Amino acid sequence: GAMGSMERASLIQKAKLAEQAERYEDMAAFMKGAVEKGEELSCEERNLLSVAYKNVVGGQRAAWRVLSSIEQKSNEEGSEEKGPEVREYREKVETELQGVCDTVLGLLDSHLIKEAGDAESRVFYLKMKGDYYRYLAEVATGDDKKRIIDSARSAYQEAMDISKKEMPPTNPIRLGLALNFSVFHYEIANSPEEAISLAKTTFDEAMADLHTLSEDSYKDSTLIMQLLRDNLTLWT
Amino acid sequence: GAMGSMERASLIQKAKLAEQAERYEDMAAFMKGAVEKGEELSCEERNLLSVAYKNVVGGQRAAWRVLSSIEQKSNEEGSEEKGPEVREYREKVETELQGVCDTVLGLLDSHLIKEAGDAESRVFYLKMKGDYYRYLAEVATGDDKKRIIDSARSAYQEAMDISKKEMPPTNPIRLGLALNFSVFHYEIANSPEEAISLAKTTFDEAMADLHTLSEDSYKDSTLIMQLLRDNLTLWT
Amino acid sequence: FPATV
Amino acid sequence: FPATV
């Protein structure tokens, strides 16, 4: 790989620079190189990896939705035939999105998850696995769609099981996992009641544990609790 | 080139889609393919070309400035040595920027400018030539820096000479050229007085011609006049 | 769209 | 930075 000749520490340094420059594709490429060195990632390094790919795929998802909406409108009654170009370009964006997802899933499978023994690392990686299968599910229309959805569910569920055993209810990773799994239920699994129940129970159990926290931990936890509340407000 | 098999009209259609999706790298690649078909560009097509590359290089310039500032800070007294990584990454971004500029300049030279006989097209392309040499000048530090600056000046000056002969003082292309040439004077040529004189004279001559315009032309002209005023306010 | 992290 | 178009 093109980053094989660069020192691990230099890749991490450059990922941080790329983040400051809002160069998320470069950030992701640097972090992929760092992962491929084969050593486990620290907390900060796991966060860099996640931020980089979240921003790259986030932009691809936004573009895919714009193009999909145009394509859907083209297929309404009374819409003039404009040829294959909208489908082709939506497909191009879709294929690039799928590529990025497959790259992340590949890093997780070779070999981040299998080496992650602490709850904080293992839950984080399993949540990412769920997230990138969820993005694949958003664009899936074929024979494998159910298996893709189930892959996301399974990863999220394993993460949830560990998180509930090993982490306090205010832990930001536990909270972020629950946030995202709740969105999976609402948007992917056609399970809005499960989505709402998960968000509410997660919020409420977190609330009850805030008293244990420092000011700084309180700030971290309450930020994600507000995201849960924001989703609940959207859904109820 | 990778767009050689795609119809001209399809490339233009996809450039418009890419713009809607804020996929400016794709937009630029589509427009490069369209130019390489060898036919002259309509007004709308010239605008697509310009928008695409302005947005790509704009993002590269912003990133280059972030990295350059970090690099400059690293070279101050009392700054800890952090190795070659900041310079390397600034160089990487710089090389990519230069590549994009060279691509645009190449399209202009082969063969957009030489086929452009109407003032509106020729001025527009010569302004772009000035703009992309200006971006090269922003990052130039070597033997050729003076020649790069002079290439920008020459292109802008030829555009100015045609614009003054052939276009009314409110014409948006004439106004945009003057705006950008004034910035060249201020930021590249170390000529703030020339920059201010050009912006003021351009504004004032435009003001005097607004009475000739429809409502819609008035809106177009006054928008760019306000940009001139904004720069004057910054500089005085 | 809903919030995710 | 100054305005350009």
Ligand SMILES: *CC(=O)N1CC2(CCN(C(=O)C3(Nc4ccc(Cl)cc4)CCOCC3)CC2)C1
């Ligand atoms: C090292 C580690 O395990 N970390 C640092 C993180 C905890 C704090 N944090 C946040 O609170 C964010 N992002 C995320 C929270 C939770 C998860 Cl699972 C993923 C990201 C910061 C950005 O705004 C949202 C909250 C960063 C990550 C987990």
Ligand SMILES: *CC(=O)N1CC2(CCN(C(=O)C3(Nc4ccc(Cl)cc4)CCOCC3)CC2)C1
């Ligand atoms: C076809 C043609 O020659 N055009 C369309 C343009 C005139 C209107 N226009 C603007 O007013 C913009 N952009 C620019 C103005 C002038 C120049 Cl030289 C370049 C771009 C629209 C975006 O906000 C700024 C004013 C688009 C281009 C020239």
Ligand SMILES: [Mg+2]
């Ligand atoms: Mg080493």
Ligand SMILES: [Mg+2]
């Ligand atoms: Mg497909």
Ligand SMILES: [Mg+2]
């Ligand atoms: Mg339950």
Ligand SMILES: [Mg+2]
């Ligand atoms: Mg043809």
Ligand SMILES: [Mg+2]
């Ligand atoms: Mg260089």
Ligand SMILES: [Mg+2]
């Ligand atoms: Mg003069």
